[PDB]
């Protein structure tokens with residue numbers, strides 16, 4: 001541990017941090033804290049065994065590099081990165097520091113029935129951040145209420161945290177083509193998840209709360225309708241097909257009858273997100289232009305990202321090389 005760092009234990013895990021970070025409190029391996037250098041509250045994450053294996057080392061580097069890369073008002077912002085390591089020989093831990101927001105979307109839904117205007121503003125920001133992420137060539141793949149952080153004024157940022165305890169199941173928000181093991185899914189998977197999130201903000205409860213895999217699929221088909229064989233063929237592996245074929249056929253339901261009393265514009269947009277055929281899902285960029293967001297839409301203030309270049313992290317290297325590369329990335333921040 002460096003000079004100017006101090007150590008404490010937070011629920012049987014040791015944290016070693018610089019003096020500038022005070023009052024660590026599990027959120028939570030994420031803590032809230034006050035950063036005395038930045039003069040603001042922050043979140044701090046202690047990565048879990050970052051160099052345990054090649055895949056952990058690759059994901060450690062990627063998380064650091066990706067957060068360096070993504071600078072957008074609706075995506076969690078990297079503010080600092082540190083290690084208690086004094087040199088490469090004892091480099092074993094990586095800590096990331098980001099914006100801290102007031103709460104997550106689950107908290108919001110649990111405490112309040114959201115006005116239509118608040119739903120507009122929240123989904124607008126979610127899509128604006130998503131436009132930026134997708135323009136970078138990045139797929140989120142785990143959008144769900146616990147990965148969306150919001151302030152009392154409804155400002156929103158996308159994050160990615162990475163079972164019996166406020167647990168929110170990925171299963172409830174996951175595109176059916178991911179569930180059915182389609183090997184060539186693309187960024188539209190995130191639009192499915194946004195449709196699930198928006199539905200939940202509108203109704204105050206999850207739209208497809210499956211108790212298991214089969215129950216998840218049954219709930220989805222009951223609303224969107226059983227796909228044709230042709231569409232089933234492009235959203236599933238050969239083996240996963242049978243799970244769908246064995247269900248009795250279900251017609252598509254009118255979303256107006258599910259979301260009785262919602263803004264008809266909200267219903268219209270939902271029907272362009274919650275579809276099985278990806279060709280027919282609205283992009284994040286197009287969705288921002290929808291009349292549901294006419295209060296907020298501003299084409300000059302919905303920016304693109306530079307493409308995230310995967311070339312370095314994709315190259316084969318040893319665990320020792322990964323440590324050296326990542327150490328340099330940490331020190332350069």
Ligand SMILES: Cc1cn(-c2cc(NC(=O)c3ccc(C)c(Nc4nccc(-c5cccnc5)n4)c3)cc(C(F)(F)F)c2)cn1
Nearest residue numbers: 030043044045059062063076096098100101103149159160
């Ligand atoms: C290998 C890999 C990683 N990622 C990825 C990681 C993150 N990381 C964080 O969101 C993250 C990292 C460190 C910290 C400290 C935080 N902060 C955090 N974590 C959990 C909860 C909260 C929180 C909750 C409520 C209010 N405010 C903050 N903040 C996030 C974010 C992304 C995203 F969304 F941008 F694409 C992608 C993708 N592939």
Ligand SMILES: [Cl-]
Nearest residue numbers: 080081082333
């Ligand atoms: Cl630093």
